[PDB]
Design goal:
This is part of a larger assembly, with chains A and B. Chain A has one helix at residues 19-35. Chain A is mainly alpha-helical. In chain A, 40% of the residues lie in helices and 0% in strands. Chain B is mainly alpha-helical. Chain B is built from eight helices and four strands; from the N terminus they run αβααβααβααβα. Chain B has a two-stranded antiparallel ribbon. Classes of the chains: A mainly alpha, B mainly alpha. Chain B: Residues 6-41, 83-118 form the EF-hand domain. Chain B: One of its GO terms (molecular function) is structural constituent of muscle. Chain B: Myosin is a hexamer of 2 heavy chains and 4 light chains.
Amino acid sequence: AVVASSHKGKQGPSFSYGELEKQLLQANPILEAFGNAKTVKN
Amino acid sequence: CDFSEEQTAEFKEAFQLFDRTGDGKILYSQCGDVMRALGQNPTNAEVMKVLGNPKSDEMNLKTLNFEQFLPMMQTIAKNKDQGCFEDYVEGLRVFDKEGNGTVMGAEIRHVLVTLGEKMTEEEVEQLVAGHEDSNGCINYEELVRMVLSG
């Protein structure tokens, strides 16, 4: 999402995600909530 | 020395044209760009390789008489012959990511600012013949000829 970012013209944790990218990087917590549990291993 | 009496005289006359503050000399910081302007094109490193002091109190404080400047210019005039048209065209051919002459200004800016010694945001604007909009498309073939004639 950082390296293949689109640029219209031409820090640390922070980065300006596009509309699709921001949603893609938000898909993870959504899927994890519905799909993950706690076990002795993990 | 390789220079003729006429060439030495021409160098003296050129040396006299500069609007210096009456020092009767030339500053070590400035002399490189003088030699560039008047003749052959040395690198930033070459100005030290000619046995000029690589460390000093200040390069603006260090200064040279014509008797010291003349051999410093002579050695690069003889030993610092620059590349062929073929060599620079080959270099740009290998550089060009479009492989057709029409290089991108952002990539040109990268290889002048980031790589080697950092060329300034004032230099690049006076070097680039075209412009850098959202396209940035400029032909290197004109630029190579321009700097070949320089």
